[PDB]
């Protein structure tokens, strides 16, 4: 915190900044050394750990040590300024120009969030929309996790072409935490083959030399090769790579946390500067400081966050559910944390659900209403009252996220309905200094996570920075609450996931990586025992031994305890069937590994 | 004789007691300024739009709004330097005609048109997002509220933003008004029916405003001082009876001791106390005097300004339905004297705590600062002002304080600000 002026104390570096620390894995896949024993931490300790991981986002680099480029680096800040100047040219010509944000999973949902946010920013100035979003799914992935739709470079390039039809100037921002998603890779490739109208921008948090160098099946290049192509265009100002190192996740792989948070911080700050200059280093630091302010305010309520975590944990224990009701854009942020509970922690979609005021009309998704697609797609407050409410019990936990500028009346009446069914009501309330919570809600609510935001004298843009602060704050809380609850449930071995359904190529390679670090055997043998567990057969044939990874995923998608079985079978020498029976006889998946560990 | 001296001695406070009072005030100020504990603090220390920031804003910058019949006047006040670099204030305005539909229509469409006129003139002067201090003056035809309705109107549009603290109060308006004439004025104070204070705090000290450079007027709302129990060893039994009998049991404790609202009520309770002890009126009072609110605050002011023959004193007590003796009138005056004196010294301690804070925060061994003042009990009440002035000067050692009253005959709030600003411009 010596170079620039900061308003939050970040942890000192930083074993992950050394090249010798887990060199096999890229930064985004490495294990965070601060959380080496996260599996055995009480609620308040979990809050502290994750609050420190999120603090690593705002760390600045030491130039003399020659390590990774951080958020506060000359090159990173300069890149943000260059892309911002490109965004301006798009905004100068709203007729034929278009800014496109694209990503997979969380990155995709964030792309939607920021697209609508800056569309509403332009709408406030009576301007025409210039932002579009593209996500793997597509819009069906706003409510459900479709991890399998990530490995298709062709379908990515096509959808990008379909959107920018008729546009003369396109600024594309592909998001991969990450640098692994073939979907984004294909889009960047398509952009570089049409540089007359497309300007490619890659957003990630791994060095270009750490991207996946494995040939994308059914395609010509790897991610690293496509990235290195963009890097040559980068030096010539033809394209741009925005990849500041942010550090490993609290639980490794979960890019929905630091990766998601940094992506939101990075792009919003970048785009805000564009609309403001409609570019100095002074500008960026003013905006980034507000995000640091957002971090401090959020974790000043660590006591309250810890309570909400344990409350959700007790609910999950009693076979209960967490229902997140959000007002405005905070409702969408509520959904983003609910949708990632299914793939990350192997949870039923009924376990954690999110709702928004009001419905898809507020989400502003391009495919309109999706409520007809099934029960889980009913995601408004009206849908919650109609369907969900008359079935919740005492073991359920209902969370409410709103501001002090929302309809405090309809919120007050809603508490009365929920109290009729359950006592576990938690409230995340935002407020601008200095408006105060009425005694009505204050005496009706048990414990409330209240957040007060300082006045912003930042011209027209101040109001949106306020919204971004509230959105990011809510995310961090929901990130910590959901992840912390399932941590208390025993879904984490140390600081990485062991049991997860291999739904894409990245998860397959991750499963291989987990095998490599628990055992001492090579990648050759790790891929073997993994395949042995997927197909069940002890001796792999030839029709499956020459089958592509995409085929293995389609076969492992319907298998449970895939990786845990493969781990035990390699850890102690035994048949896959013996490894499978040893797990069923153990009290937990974690215990089956620890017993086989020695 | 000594019995009435023992009853009225509960209001007495020594110089040492005034010291803890002002130090406990300073603690509540610091607690309210911090973002962490602002929620539970009794003194909110609310930030305003009145600021001297490097973004161009200066103290005295104001947007005055005045509705009258079907006419709406927006006034832009901007202060700064000229070519010579000397102090200068400018004034601009524009008239508007309220539609007949908007006048008869609900309050929503009224403020919708109001916000429309504001947006239109701010764009014309290119200061739509400068966040200027706001003030309203109403005068409709004869056949949280105002700021809330205007906020909702701006929200319905959505082309700019306003905060709940945008509108200044009468206390802040006093500071600005006196600042226009004496630029050393950085403290506003009103001691009328209610009591409030505002002062220029360093931006770095205000955690409720994301800024580190410049100064900003902080609306203390210090009337709620003691709401968290830090004033319980200063409040007498009469104060507690007054509190519980009010419309807000437990709120605005400090204001109920130094404010003029319950000044007459405190004197009345003391009078009844003496009557029950056979020290006044023969031991019996009229049914009127035993009713809450019968002893008006203006009575207290008049008795304290009456001759030795008790002409006005006897006249008032006659109306209350009691034939008082000369000894009775003497006892009543001492009771009025006792209550008003406590109000003066405690209000002095509060202001001294602010002044001492500014002195300590500005690293000056001699703080040259003017205090703008207003209010019925400061202006009209005789002995109050002198006792007030003497007590601050006694407690503000290290400061050279100048006091100036608001310009009489111009009104309050925006009307006061607009009038003084126009006078300095011409
Ligand atoms: O949220 C998660 C994992 O918690 C995934 O849905 C990511 O959104 C996806 O992996 C994005 O891919 P990358 O950004 O890592 O390339
Ligand atoms: Na400040």
């Amino acid at each position: 915190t010596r170079k620039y002026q900061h308003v939050i104390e970040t942890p000192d570096p930083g074993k992950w900044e050394l090249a010798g620390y887990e060199e096999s894995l890229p930064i985004s896949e490495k294990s965070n050394p601060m959380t080496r024993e996260l599996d055995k931490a009480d609620p308040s300790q979990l809050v502290q750990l994750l609050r420190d991981c999120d603090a690593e986002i705002f760390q600045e680099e030491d130039e003399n040590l020659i390590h990774y480029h951080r958020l506060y680096s000359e090159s990173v800040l300069k890149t943000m300024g260059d892309v911002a100047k490109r965004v301006q040219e798009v905004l100068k010509n709203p007729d034929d120009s278009l800014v496109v944000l694209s990503g997979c999973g969380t990155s995709g949902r964030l792309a939607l969030l920021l697209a609508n946010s800056f569309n509403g920013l332009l709408k406030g100035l009576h301007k025409t929309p210039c932002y579009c979003y593209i996500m793997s799914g597509g819009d069906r992935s706003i409510v459900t996790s479709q991890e399998s739709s990530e490995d298709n470079p062709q379908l990515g390039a096509q959808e990008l072409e379909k959107v920018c039809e008729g546009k003369k100037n396109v600024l594309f921002i592909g998001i991969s935490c990450g640098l692994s998603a073939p979907f984004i890779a294909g889009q960047l490739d398509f952009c570089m083959r049409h540089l007359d109208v497309y300007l490619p921008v890659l957003v990630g948090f791994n060095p270009v030399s750490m991207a996946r160098n494995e040939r994308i099946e059914g395609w010509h290049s790897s991610f690293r090769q496509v990235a290195e192509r963009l890097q040559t265009l980068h030096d010539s100002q033809k394209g741009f790579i925005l990849n500041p190192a942010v550090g490993p996740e609290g639980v490794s792989g979960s890019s929905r946390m630091k990766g998601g948070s940094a992506t939101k911080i990075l792009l919003e700050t970048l785009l805000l500067v564009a609309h403001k200059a409609e570019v100095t280093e002074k500008c960026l630091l003013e905006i980034l400081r507000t995000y640091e302010r957002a971090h401090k305010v959020t974790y000043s309520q660590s006591k309250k966050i810890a309570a909400l975590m344990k409350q959700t944990a007790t609910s999950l224990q009693k076979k209960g559910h967490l229902y997140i009701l959000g007002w405005g854009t905070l409702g969408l942020v509520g959904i983003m944390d609910a949708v990632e509970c299914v793939p990350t922690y192997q949870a039923d979609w009924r376990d954690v659900r999110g709702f928004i005021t009001g419905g898809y009309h507020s989400i502003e998704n391009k495919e309109g209403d999706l409520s007809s697609l099934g029960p889980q797609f009913s995601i408004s407050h009206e849908d919650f009252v109609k369907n969900v409410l008359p079935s919740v019990s005492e073991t359920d936990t209902v969370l409410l996220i709103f501001t002090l500028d929302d309809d405090l009346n309809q919120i007050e009446k809603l508490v009365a309905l929920v109290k009729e069914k359950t006592s576990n009501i938690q409230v995340i309330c935002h407020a601008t200094a200095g408006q105060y919570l009425p005694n009505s809600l204050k005496k009706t609510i048990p414990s409330i996570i209240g957040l007060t935001w300082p006045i912003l004298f930042l011209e027209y843009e101040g109001a949106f920075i306020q919204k971004f602060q509230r959105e990011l704050s809510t995310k961090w809380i929901l990130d910590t609450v959901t992840s912390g609850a399932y941590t208390l449930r025993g879904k984490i071995f140390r600081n990485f996931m062991v049991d997860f359904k291999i739904n894409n190529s990245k998860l397959f390679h991750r499963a291989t990586s987990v095998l490599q670090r628990l055992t001492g055997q090579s990648q050759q043998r790790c891929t073997e025992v993994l395949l042995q567990s997927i197909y069940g057969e002890q001796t792999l044939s030839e029709q499956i031994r020459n089958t592509t990874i995409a085929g293995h995923v389609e076969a492992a998608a319907s298998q449970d305890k895939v990786l845990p079985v493969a781990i035990v079978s390699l850890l102690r020498s035994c048949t896959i069937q013996d490894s499978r029976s040893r797990i069923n006889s153990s009290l937990s998946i974690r215990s089956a590994i620890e017993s086989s560990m020695n | 004789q000594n019995e009435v001296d023992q009853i009225l001695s509960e209001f007495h406070l020594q110089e040492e007691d005034l010291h803890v009072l002002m130090c406990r005030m300073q603690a509540e100020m610091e607690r309210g300024l911090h973002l962490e504990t602002n929620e539970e603090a009794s003194v909110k220390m609310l930030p305003t739009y009145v600021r001297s920031t490097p973004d161009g804003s200066e103290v005295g910058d104001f947007l005055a709004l005045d509705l009258g019949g079907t006419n709406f006047r927006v006034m832009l006040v901007k202060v700064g330097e000229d070519l010579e670099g000397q102090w200068k204030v400018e004034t601009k305005h524009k008239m508007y005609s309220i539609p007949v539909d908007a006048m008869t229509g609900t309050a929503e469409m009224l403020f919708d048109y109001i916000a429309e006129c504001i947006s239109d003139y701010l764009d014309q002067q290119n200061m739509k997002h400068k966040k200027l201090p706001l003030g309203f003056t109403f005068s409709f035809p004869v056949r949280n509220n105002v700021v809330g309705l205007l906020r909702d109107a701006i929200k319905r549009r959505g082309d700019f933003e306003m905060d709940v603290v945008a509108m200044v109060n009468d206390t802040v308006a006093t500071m600005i008004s006196c600042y226009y004439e004496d630029h050393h004025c950085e403290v506003g104070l009103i001691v009328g029916t209610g009591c409030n204070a505002c002062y220029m705090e360093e931006m770095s000290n205000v955690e409720l405003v994301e800024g580190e450079e410049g100064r900003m007027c902080v609306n203390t709302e210090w009337g709620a001082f003691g709401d968290t129990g830090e004033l319980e060893d200063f409040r007498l039994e009469y104060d507690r009876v007054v509190d519980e009998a009010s419309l807000n049991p437990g709120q605005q404790l400090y204001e109920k001791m130094i404010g003029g609202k319950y000044m007459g009520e405190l004197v009345r309770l003391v009078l009844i106390k003496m009557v029950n002890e056979n020290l006044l009126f023969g031991g019996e009072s009229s049914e009127k005097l035993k009713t809450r609110g019968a002893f008006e605050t203006q009575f207290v002011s008049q008795i304290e300004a009456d001759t030795s023959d008790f002409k006005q004193t006897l006249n008032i007590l006659r109306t209350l339905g009691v034939q008082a003796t000369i000894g009775d009138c003497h006892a009543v005056r001492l009771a009025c004297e006792s209550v008003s004196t406590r109000a003066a010294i405690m209000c002095s301690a509060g202001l001294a705590g602010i002044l001492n804070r500014m002195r300590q925060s500005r690293r000056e061994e001699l703080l040259r600062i003017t205090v703008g003042v207003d209010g019925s009990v400061y202006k009209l009440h005789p002995s109050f002002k002198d006792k007030f002035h003497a007590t601050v000067l006694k407690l503000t050692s290290g400061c050279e304080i100048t006091f100036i009253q608001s310009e009489e005959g111009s009104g309050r709030g925006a009307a006061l600000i607009s009038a003084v600003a126009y006078k300095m411009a011409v």
Side-chain angles (χ1 to χ4, degrees), chain A residues 245-257:
Chain A
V246 96
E249 305 286 343
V251 43
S252 79
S254 299
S255 58
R256 54 180 283 264
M257 317 231 282

Side-chain angles (χ1 to χ4, degrees), chain A residues 293 454-455, chain B residues 33 202-213 216:
Chain A
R293 179 59 56 186
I455 305 183
Chain B
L33 287 176
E202 310 300 321
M203 191 72 55
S204 57
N205 288 123
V206 183
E207 295 186 2
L208 300 199
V209 163
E210 195 60 40
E212 219 74 18
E213 299 171 345
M216 185 203 50

Side-chain angles (χ1 to χ4, degrees), chain B residues 41-114:
Chain B
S42 57
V43 185
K44 296 309 182 182
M45 308 289 292
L46 295 183
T48 64
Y49 278 6
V50 180
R51 54 201 159 98
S52 289
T53 53
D55 74 333
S57 295
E58 291 275 56
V59 172
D61 296 344
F62 195 84
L63 183 59
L65 311 177
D66 180 35
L67 191 150
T70 57
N71 297 18
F72 189 76
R73 174 181 135 274
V74 285
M75 168 163 285
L76 190 273
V77 180
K78 176 61 186 176
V79 329
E81 302 87 11
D82 56 338
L83 294 179
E84 189 66 26
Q86 288 292 108
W87 194 92
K88 184 190 61 180
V89 52
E90 304 190 69
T91 22
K92 299 168 178 55
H93 82 276
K94 188 178 185 180
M95 294 303 303
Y96 290 88
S97 178
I98 322 288
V100 57
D101 320 275
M103 219 67 207
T104 58
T106 177
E108 283 69 18
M109 41 209 305
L110 172 64
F111 283 92
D112 277 20
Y113 178 76
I114 288 182

Side-chain angles (χ1 to χ4, degrees), chain A residues 412-519:
Chain A
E412 192 104 36
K413 65 98 190 302
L414 183 54
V415 180
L417 271 65
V418 181
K419 280 190 174 184
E420 189 105 19
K421 292 296 181 177
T422 177
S423 171
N424 299 325
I425 301 184
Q426 306 266 347
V427 161
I428 302 178
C429 181
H430 299 269
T432 299
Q435 60 196 187
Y436 297 88
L437 183 68
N439 281 84
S440 320
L441 290 169
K442 188 165 56 183
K443 227 169 187 294
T444 308
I445 233 60
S447 187
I448 165 184
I449 312 186
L451 305 133
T452 308
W453 300 102
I455 305 183
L456 292 176
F457 298 104
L458 298 161
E459 304 290 298
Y460 169 76
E461 298 186 330
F464 301 96
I465 303 184
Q466 263 281 168
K467 188 174 73 68
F468 299 154
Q469 277 177 330
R470 293 186 266 103
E471 292 178 5
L472 179 57
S473 177
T474 309
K475 173 182 177 59
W476 272 330
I477 299 174
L478 294 187
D479 280 20
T480 302
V481 164
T482 52
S483 179
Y486 283 102
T487 300
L488 296 174
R489 282 283 78 223
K491 286 284 187 175
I492 287 86
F493 190 74
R494 295 175 184 177
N495 50 344
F496 51 85
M497 220 74 65
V498 159
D499 186 27
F500 58 91
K501 283 203 178 58
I502 306 176
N503 296 335
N504 61 41
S505 57
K506 184 184 60 181
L507 295 181
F508 186 88
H509 294 136
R510 180 175 299 169
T512 299
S513 301
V514 173
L515 286 163
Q516 296 182 218
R517 77 186 310 167
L518 289 182
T519 70

Side-chain angles (χ1 to χ4, degrees), chain A residues 5 124-126 290 293 296-297 300-301 405 432-436 450 452 454-457 459-460 463, chain B residues 35-36 38-39 44 46-49 51 129-131 151 155 158-159 161 163-165 207-210:
Chain A
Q5 170 183 338
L125 298 180
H126 304 287
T290 63
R293 179 59 56 186
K296 201 179 201 306
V297 167
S300 65
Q301 300 291 312
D405 293 329
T432 299
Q435 60 196 187
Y436 297 88
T452 308
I455 305 183
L456 292 176
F457 298 104
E459 304 290 298
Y460 169 76
Chain B
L35 178 54
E36 292 273 354
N38 177 268
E39 309 172 3
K44 296 309 182 182
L46 295 183
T48 64
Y49 278 6
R51 54 201 159 98
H129 310 97
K130 298 299 180 181
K131 286 190 175 183
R151 277 242 306 176
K155 172 147 185 171
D159 47 331
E161 184 65 31
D163 302 280
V164 301
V165 303
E207 295 186 2
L208 300 199
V209 163
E210 195 60 40

